[PDB]
Design a protein around this ligand. Structure first.
Ligand SMILES: *SCC1=CC(C)(C)N(O)C1(C)C
Ligand SMILES: *SCC1=CC(C)(C)N(O)C1(C)C
Length: 116
């Protein structure tokens, strides 16, 4: 329970020991080993659960209201992590949930602020 702490722990582990060269911002993929033989499910499996065109939608709104976009991705994660899942999110699905999230909301914003 309370996966709030475990969440940061997941990214914290990745933030430890890195490299990838770096140097300002310019490198955006190209040639790097990862999977190879066999399949490749893992998180990559959820990346396909989002249509290509729909992928742009969540990206577009996020640039304006990441708070709502954050809940949309969380909705699918719960479905995929649980089992309820049974459909590939779409531009309408993202918007549909986003529209429903704005109705329920939570209490306030407090977004991109806990970043410490
Ligand atoms: S809880 C913070 C968080 C959630 C998820 C979308 C899995 N992430 O990549 C971060 C670690 C930012
Ligand atoms: S920990 C950073 C991170 C993990 C993952 C869930 C793959 N993400 O989308 C970000 C880049 C936020």
């Amino acid at each position: 329970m309370d996966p709030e702490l475990q969440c940061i722990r997941e990214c914290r582990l990745a933030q430890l020991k890195n490299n990838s060269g770096g140097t300002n911002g310019d490198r955006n993929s190209g040639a790097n080993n990862g999977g190879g033989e066999n399949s490749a499910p893992v998180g990559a499996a959820i990346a396909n659960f989002l249509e290509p065109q729909a992928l742009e939608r969540l990206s577009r709104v996020a640039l304006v209201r990441r708070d709502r976009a954050q809940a949309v991705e969380t909705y699918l994660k719960k479905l995929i992590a649980t089992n309820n899942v049974t459909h590939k999110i779409t531009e309408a699905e993202i918007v549909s949930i986003l529209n429903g999230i704005a109705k329920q909301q939570n209490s306030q914003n407090n977004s991109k602020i806990i970043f410490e």
